[PDB]
């Protein structure tokens with residue numbers, strides 16, 4: 138339907154089984170809502186030892202991905218994608234991912250995700266082959282595969298059929314009714330649908346204010362949200 | 376040595392093969408620098424259908440993780456860890472991970488990572504069993520397993536033997552010397568070690584200023600960094 142195709146360039150394509158074989162994303166793949174197709178630069182080498190790294194000009198302790206096998210793998214993925222695939226490189230230098238960015242990326246029917254290893258890739262391939270650079274957060278990983286899988290999982294939630302507002306989630310409770318002396322809030326047992334809705338929203342506002350108050354500055358709260366937030370801050374200050 | 380033990384509670388422990396079987400983290404596991412041990416709540420069920428989810432009090436469309444199998448799995452992991460393991464729950468409601476937070480977390484010799492599925496876990500288990508909540512970024516995933524693997528990979532880079540300053544990385548170049556008409560900066564072929572160091576630092580300052588200027592506000596630049604940043608901004612404005 139609104140299915141999504143994701144090409145992946147990675148030296149460790151088997152890592153992607155973590156999303157393609159399990160849970161909600163594994164079901165999306167099995168039901169053809171999400172297709173994930175991997176190309177490995179190692180298969181595009183020609184020397185006897187299948188070399189995929191190379192030395193940086195200028196010296197330094199690290200290696201980079203070797204240009205030729207990576208470029209050839211990218212070209213093959215682009216040819217398989219046909220027209221209109223956006224090519225994304227995952228790196229700490231990229232645009233910081235957030236939920237608005239996920240929903241932007243989810244608009245593409247095709248994406249190609251390039252997973253860097255070693256110290257990364259040659260800057261000229263970014264210029265010539267990459268459309269957008271994205272980061273999953275301000276921290277350093279050993280390769281771009283976990284960022285690519287994170288991005289796939291986040292976008293997959295927007296594909297119609299895969300599943301069944303700016304604020305943090307409210308607390309949730311399940312059985313039993315008392316757990317190490319802690320009881321479930323009585324409103325949640327009241328059956329009063331509207332009191333339950335307002336309690337949950339007031340809790341989300343309170344938790345957002347206490348934990349991540351900067352997230353509130355970016356929202357235009359509704360009148361109801363403004364009132365419940367005021368109530369929660371009054372209670373907090375009592 | 377400074378090895379690290381990470382207990383994981385997950386309904387999909389096989390996802391963790393993505394970090395334990397491949398690349399730098401797979402080597403860390405093989406060489407006993409990193410141990411990752413998984414417990415699955417499904418193995419702590421007692422009904423015929425091995426039920427691991429439960430309905431939220433108050434209604435709503437989602438399910439939560441069932442308390443009893445999850446609590447029992449957590450208790451088993453804590454007993455295996457012995458004393459001093461910090462128990463972390465991965466969620467969007469948690470403290471936002473960044474590199475300073477990774478280095479804080481890397482100080483622990485033992486961690487237990489609880490991976491939520493469905494709409495998450497009962498709030499009272501957070502109160503009774505979880506030490507810290509952490510988020511990998513402001514976006515929603517289908518479970519906490521990719522956040523846990525991201526955290527493991529980021530912390531593993533701090534374990535002595537696993538591998539071979541606030542700014543984004545400089546561009547890097549490898550063979551060939553000309554690539555679709557784009558040449559390598561001559562300084563990197565100069566062999567002048569000190570000119571190369573300064574060029575790389577000036578590029579990191581320039582890229583940080585242009586892409587993520589808020590990161591600069593949190594740094595106390597050195598005199599040399601202040602001078603190279605000034606030079607880069609002068610060049611940019613020429």
Ligand SMILES: CN(C)c1ccccc1CNc1ccc(C(N)=O)cn1
Nearest residue numbers: 227228229253257272273278280281
């Ligand atoms: C080895 N490095 C630093 C590297 C350098 C450049 C590109 C890819 C990599 C692979 N590592 C990544 C990738 C993404 C993220 C992120 N925060 O999105 C963190 N680490």
Ligand SMILES: CN(C)c1ccccc1CNc1ccc(C(N)=O)cn1
Nearest residue numbers: 465466467491495510511516518519
């Ligand atoms: C299903 N949800 C929303 C959920 C709710 C609460 C806990 C765990 C989960 C599992 N999903 C996660 C986990 C972490 C992150 C993150 N940004 O660190 C994103 N999603």
